[PDB]
Amino acid sequence: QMLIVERYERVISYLYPIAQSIPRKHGVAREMFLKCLLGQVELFIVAGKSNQVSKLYAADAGLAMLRFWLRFLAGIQKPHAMTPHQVETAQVLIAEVGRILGSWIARVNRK
Amino acid sequence: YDQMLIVERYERVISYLYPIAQSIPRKHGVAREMFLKCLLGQVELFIVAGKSNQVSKLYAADAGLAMLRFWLRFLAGIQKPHAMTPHQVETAQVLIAEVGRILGSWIARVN
Amino acid sequence: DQMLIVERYERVISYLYPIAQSIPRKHGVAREMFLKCLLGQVELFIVAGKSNQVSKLYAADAGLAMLRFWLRFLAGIQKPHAMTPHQVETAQVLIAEVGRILGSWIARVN
Amino acid sequence: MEPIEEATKCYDQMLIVERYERVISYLYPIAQSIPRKHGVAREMFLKCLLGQVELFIVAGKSNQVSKLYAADAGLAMLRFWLRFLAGIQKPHAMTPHQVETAQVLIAEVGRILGSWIARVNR
Amino acid sequence: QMLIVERYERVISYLYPIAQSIPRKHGVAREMFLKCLLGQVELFIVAGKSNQVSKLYAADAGLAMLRFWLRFLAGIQKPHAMTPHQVETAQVLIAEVGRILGSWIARVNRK
Amino acid sequence: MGKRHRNLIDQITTWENLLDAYRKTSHGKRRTWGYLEFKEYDLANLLALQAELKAGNYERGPYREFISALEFKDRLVQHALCNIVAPIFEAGLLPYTYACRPDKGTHAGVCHVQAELRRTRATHFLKSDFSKFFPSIDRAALYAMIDKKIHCAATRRLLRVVLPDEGVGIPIGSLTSQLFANVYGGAVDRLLHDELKQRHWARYMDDIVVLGDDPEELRAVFYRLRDFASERLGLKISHWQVAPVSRGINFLGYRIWPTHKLLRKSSVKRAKRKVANFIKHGEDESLQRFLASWSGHAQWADTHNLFTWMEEQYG
RNA sequence: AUCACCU
RNA sequence: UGGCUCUGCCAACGCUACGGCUUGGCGGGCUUAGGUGGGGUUCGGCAAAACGUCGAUUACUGAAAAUGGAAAGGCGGGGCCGACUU
Specify burial of residue A54 (Cβ count, 10 A radius: 0-12, 13-18, 19+). exposed
For CA atoms F99, F104, F105, F108, give the dihedral sign: negative
Query: Phi and psi at residue F288, in whole multiples of 5°?
Result: -65, -40
D11–F73 C-beta distance less than 8 A: no
**What's the CA gap between E33 and E31, in Å, rounded?**
6
User: In this structure, which CATH number among 1.20.1440.60, 1.10.340.30, 3.20.20.220, 3.40.50.720 belongs to the domain E4-109?
Assistant: 1.20.1440.60
Q: Work out the minimum CA distance from C59 to partner chain A, whole angstroms.
A: 6
Q: State which residues between 139 and 198 of chain F bring their CB within 7 Å of strand H.
A: 145, 147-149, 151-155, 157, 190, 193-194, 197
Q: Among all residues of chain C, which has the CA nearest to that of A37?
A: C30
Q: Which long-range contacts (CB under 8 A, 24 or more apart) does F121-124 make?
A: F121/F213, F121/F258, F122/F200, F122/F211, F122/F212, F122/F213, F122/F245, F122/F258, F123/F213, F123/F214, F123/F215, F123/F244, F123/F245, F124/F211, F124/F212, F124/F213, F124/F214, F124/F215, F124/F217, F124/F218, F124/F242, F124/F243, F124/F244, F124/F245
**What's the CA gap between A5 and C62, in Å, rounded?**
12
Closest among C44, C34, C36, C39 to C13, alpha carbons compared: C39
**Residue C75 Cβ < 7 Å to strand H:** yes
Candidates E42, E52, E73, E93: best to mutate against D (most CBs of D within 10 A) is E42
**What's the CA gap between E6 and E49, in Å, rounded?**
16
**What's the CA gap between C67 and C12, in Å, rounded?**
10
What does the CA dihedral C20, C21, C25, C26 come to, rounded to 10 degrees?
A: -20
Q: Work out the minimum CA distance from A71 to partner chain B, whole angstroms.
A: 9
Q: Which residues pair with F261 in a beta bridge?
A: F256
**What's the CA gap between F36 and D22, in Å, rounded?**
13
**What's the CA gap between F73 and D17, in Å, rounded?**
20
Residue nearest to nucleotide H2 (CA to C1'): D37
Q: Among all residues of chain F, which has the CA nearest to that of B69?
A: F40
Å separating the CA of residue F248 from the C1' of nucleotide H39: 18
Q: Which nucleotide is nearest to D102 (CA to C1')?
A: G4
Q: Which long-range contacts (CB under 8 A, 24 or more apart) does C53-60 make?
A: C54/C106, C54/C109, C54/C110, C55/A50, C57/C102, C57/C105, C57/C106, C57/C109, C58/A46, C58/A49, C58/A50, C58/C106, C59/A46, C59/A49, C59/A50, C60/C5, C60/C102
Closest among F292, F180, F299, F194 to F233, alpha carbons compared: F180
Strand G nucleotides where any atom sits below 7 Å of a protein CB = 3-5
Å separating the CA of residue F60 from the C1' of nucleotide H69: 33
Cross-sheet strand order for the sheet of F125-127: F202-204, F207-209, F125-127, F241-243
DSSP 8-state symbol, E82? -
Q: Among all residues of chain D, which has the CA nearest to that of E47?
A: D73
Is B82:B76 a contact under the CB 8 Å cutoff?
yes
**What's the CA gap between A75 and E53, in Å, rounded?**
49
For CA atoms D85, D86, D90, D93, give the dihedral sign: positive
B100–F42 C-beta distance less than 8 A: no
- Write the CB contacts of F42 (distance below 8 Å, at least 6 apart in sequence): B73, B93, F22
Instruction: Report how far apart the first and last C-alpha atoms of chain C are (Å, whole number).
Output: 14
Chain B residues in contact with F42 (beta carbon < 8 A): 73, 93
Closest among F217, F252, F230 to F96, alpha carbons compared: F252
Greatest Cα pair distance in chain C: 43
**What's the CA gap between E71 and F251, in Å, rounded?**
78
Is F207:F273 a contact under the CB 8 Å cutoff?
no
Closest among D28, D59, E32, D82 to B31, alpha carbons compared: D28
Tally the residues of chain A. Answer: 111
Q: Which long-range contacts (CB under 8 A, 24 or more apart) does F279-288 make?
A: F279/F313, F279/F314, F279/F315, F280/F314, F284/F66, F284/F314, F284/F315, F288/F66
CATH level 3 topology of C2-109: de novo design (two linked rop proteins) (1.20.1440)
Q: State which residues between 13 and 72 of chain E bring their CB within 7 Å of strand H.
A: 19-25, 27, 30, 34
**What's the CA gap between E57 and F185, in Å, rounded?**
72
Q: Work out the minimum CA distance from A3 to partner chain B, whole angstroms.
A: 22
Strands annotated E in F93-232:
125-127, 202-204, 207-209
Closest among D85, D68, D80 to D34, alpha carbons compared: D85
Is B70:B96 a contact under the CB 8 Å cutoff?
no
In chain C, residues 81-110 whose CB comes closer than 8 Å to chain A: none
Closest among E34, E49, B42 to D71, alpha carbons compared: E49
CATH level 3 topology of D11-121: de novo design (two linked rop proteins) (1.20.1440)
Candidates B84, B91, B94, B102: best to mutate against F (most CBs of F within 10 A) is B94
Is B43:B5 a contact under the CB 8 Å cutoff?
no
**What's the CA gap between B68 and F46, in Å, rounded?**
18
Please report, as a single letter, which amino acid is at residue E88: E
Specify burial of residue A80 (Cβ count, 10 A radius: 0-12, 13-18, 19+). middle
Is C108:C100 a contact under the CB 8 Å cutoff?
no
- Write the CB contacts of F94 (distance below 8 Å, at least 6 apart in sequence): F186, F189, F190, F192, F193
Is F191:F227 a contact under the CB 8 Å cutoff?
no
Q: Which residues pair with F204 in a beta bridge?
A: F207
- DSSP codes joined into one string, F193-240: TTGGG--S-EEETTEEE---SSHHHHHHHHHHHHHHHHHTT-------
Please report, as a single letter, which amino acid is at residue F164: P
Is F303:F275 a contact under the CB 8 Å cutoff?
no
Chain D residues in contact with F315 (beta carbon < 8 A): none
Is E93:E11 a contact under the CB 8 Å cutoff?
yes
Q: Work out the minimum CA distance from C66 to partner chain A, whole angstroms.
A: 6
Q: Which nucleotide is nearest to F91 (CA to C1')?
A: H52
D90–E41 C-beta distance less than 8 A: no
Provide CATH code, domain A3-108.
1.20.1440.60
**What's the CA gap between D35 and D32, in Å, rounded?**
8
Tally the residues of chain B. Answer: 111
Put simply, whether D25 touches F (Cβ < 8 Å) is no
Chains that touch C (3 or more CB pairs under 8 A): A, E
Candidates E9, E24, E28, E45: best to mutate against D (most CBs of D within 10 A) is E45
**Cα A56 to the center of its chain, rounded Å:** 13
For CA atoms A76, A77, A82, A87, give the dihedral sign: negative
Technique of determination: cryo-EM
- Write the CB contacts of F265 (distance below 8 Å, at least 6 apart in sequence): F253, F254
CA B89-B92-B97 angle, 5° bins: 115
- DSSP codes joined into one string, A15-67: HHHHHHHS-GGGHHHHHHHHHHHTTHHHHHHHHHH---HHHHHHHHHHHHHHH
**What's the CA gap between B65 and B93, in Å, rounded?**
10
**What's the CA gap between E107 and E102, in Å, rounded?**
8
Helix (H) / strand (E) containing D10: none
- Write the CB contacts of C103 (distance below 8 Å, at least 6 apart in sequence): C61
What does the CA dihedral A51, A54, A60, A61 come to, rounded to 10 degrees?
A: -150
Q: Which nucleotide is nearest to A20 (CA to C1')?
A: H5
Q: Which are the residues after which chain A is interrupted (C to N > 2.5 Å)?
A: none
Specify burial of residue F121 (Cβ count, 10 A radius: 0-12, 13-18, 19+). exposed
Closest among F56, F4, F234 to F142, alpha carbons compared: F234
Chains that touch D (3 or more CB pairs under 8 A): B, E, F
The bridge status of strand F241-243 relative to strand F125-127 is antiparallel
Please report, as a single letter, which amino acid is at residue C65: A
Q: Give the three-class secondary structure for C100.
A: helix
Q: Work out the minimum CA distance from C103 to partner chain A, whole angstroms.
A: 11
Is D87:D52 a contact under the CB 8 Å cutoff?
no
The 10 Å CB-count burial string (b at 16+, else e) for F10-29 is ebbbbbebbbebbebbbeeb
**What's the CA gap between E20 and C54, in Å, rounded?**
35
Greatest Cα pair distance in chain D: 52
Architecture of domain B3-110: Up-down Bundle (1.20)
D80–E49 C-beta distance less than 8 A: no
Q: Work out the minimum CA distance from B103 to partner chain F, whole angstroms.
A: 14
**What's the CA gap between A17 and A11, in Å, rounded?**
10
CA C67-E17-E37 angle, 5° bins: 45
Q: Give the three-class secondary structure for A81.
A: coil
Closest among F238, F275, F299, F292 to F65, alpha carbons compared: F292
- Write the CB contacts of D1 (distance below 8 Å, at least 6 apart in sequence): F45, F48, F49, F52, F58, F73, F77
Gyration radius (Cα) of chain D, Å: 15
User: Within a 10 A sphere around the Cβ of C73, how many other Cβ atoms?
Assistant: 25
**What's the CA gap between F259 and F164, in Å, rounded?**
44
- Distance (Å) of CA A43 to CA A37, A61, F145: 10, 9, 70
Report the residue from F19, F39, F44 with minimal CB separation from B97: F44
**What's the CA gap between D107 and D23, in Å, rounded?**
9
Is F98:F104 a contact under the CB 8 Å cutoff?
yes
Gyration radius (Cα) of chain C, Å: 13
**What's the CA gap between F270 and F279, in Å, rounded?**
14
User: Within a 10 A sphere around the Cβ of F168, how many other Cβ atoms?
Assistant: 15
Is F29:F312 a contact under the CB 8 Å cutoff?
yes
**What's the CA gap between D6 and D96, in Å, rounded?**
38
**What's the CA gap between A48 and E31, in Å, rounded?**
28
Tally the residues of chain E. Answer: 111
- DSSP codes joined into one string, D35-99: -SSSHHHHHHHHHHHTTHHHHHHHHHT---HHHHHHHHHHHHHHHHHHHIIIIISSS-SS-HHHH
**What's the CA gap between C45 and C50, in Å, rounded?**
8
Is D74:D55 a contact under the CB 8 Å cutoff?
yes
Put simply, whether A60 touches B (Cβ < 8 Å) is yes
Is F133:F185 a contact under the CB 8 Å cutoff?
yes
Report the residue from E5, E9, E16 with minimal CB separation from D41: E16
Instruction: Report how far apart the first and last C-alpha atoms of chain B are (Å, whole number).
Output: 16
**What's the CA gap between F175 and E85, in Å, rounded?**
69
Q: Which nucleotide is nearest to A21 (CA to C1')?
A: H5
Candidates E2, E41, E52, E93: best to mutate against D (most CBs of D within 10 A) is E41
Chain F residues in contact with D14 (beta carbon < 8 A): 33, 36-37, 39-40
- Distance (Å) of CA D71 to CA B69, D16, F164, F171: 18, 10, 45, 41
**What's the CA gap between B92 and B84, in Å, rounded?**
9
Closest among B26, D51, D106, B71 to D98, alpha carbons compared: D106
Is C94:C12 a contact under the CB 8 Å cutoff?
yes
Q: Which residues pair with F243 in a beta bridge?
A: F125
Put simply, whether E30 touches D (Cβ < 8 Å) is yes
Q: Which residues pair with B29 in a beta bridge?
A: none
